[PDB]
């Protein structure tokens with residue numbers, strides 16, 4: 307399908323890597339490709355990252371660079387967009403006025419929680435008569451067993467059951483952030499999870515698109531590629547339909 311994509315940053319071999327892994331789409335957490343030349347058949351999706359990202363110029367650049375728009379990145383985290391639901395709702399009309407297919411802010415967690423960030427945003431948007439076309443999500447598993455794919459499926463199903471919007475998964479991996487430093491799975495554990503998770507996501511009718519975090523090991527130790535060379539996880543992602 308056209309589901310499989312990646313997050314990416316400019317590096318010697320990014321064009322080659324995107325082509326090799328067979329990404330149907332990519333995003334950069336910015337309003338344009340940030341120096342990346344996309345291969346043929348790989349769609350760029352612009353992002354409006356935070357409060358100060360909302361200008362007439364940025365919105366103009368986003369609409370010139372693609373046809374779908376992602377809203378604020380993890381507004382529920384102090385270290386990301388760090389935004390109230392009210393601030394997000396008050397800026398919303400400027401994003402809506404581009405006429406582009408429009409994704410909700412992507413919450414770090416608690417998407418299905420009554421009274422949580424996403425729940426208050428979607429209920430506020432409905433009350434104001436706003437348009438929200440789809441809901442992008444982040445998910446990071448701290449259980450590194452075969453059970454992980456089932457845990458991810460339960461979260462996506464729960465957010466779909468609550469809001470009945472199609473789902474994007476714009477960041478996912480195995481990472482435990484609970485401790486004082488991040489904990490990662492073994493190479494074989496991560497590769498097995500790539501295979502099982504991609505098969506499940508390809509088969510789930512209400513999931514439109516997904517993006518492993520992330521393409522390159524220069525971004526994150528959960529990276530799929532070092533330069534133009536895939537590791538065992540990159541090999542599994544390339545194999546996915």
Ligand SMILES: OC[C@H]1O[C@@H](O[C@@H]2[C@@H](O)[C@H](O[C@@H]3[C@@H](O)[C@H](O)O[C@H](CO)[C@H]3O)O[C@H](CO)[C@H]2O)[C@H](O)[C@@H](O)[C@@H]1O
Pocket residue numbers: 334335336340355356357358359379386525
């Ligand atoms: O548009 C104005 C706005 O730009 C912001 O800069 C962003 C970065 O915040 C963003 O950072 C990404 C993280 O959010 C994510 O969690 O991890 C990835 C991988 O390391 C980061 O790239 O990256 C994009 C592209 O480089 C930047 O445009 C400023 O932070 C913000 O202060 C400013 O208002």
Ligand SMILES: OC[C@H]1O[C@@H](O[C@@H]2[C@@H](O)[C@H](O)O[C@H](CO)[C@H]2O)[C@H](O)[C@@H](O)[C@@H]1O
Pocket residue numbers: 380383385413414415444445446477483
């Ligand atoms: O900025 C750190 C990264 O954290 C990710 O979310 C984490 C959740 O998975 C976890 O359940 O809770 C913690 C909060 O204590 C989150 O940090 C974000 O989704 C990532 O975008 C982010 O890079």
Ligand SMILES: [Zn+2]
Pocket residue numbers: 392393396
């Ligand atoms: Zn207000």
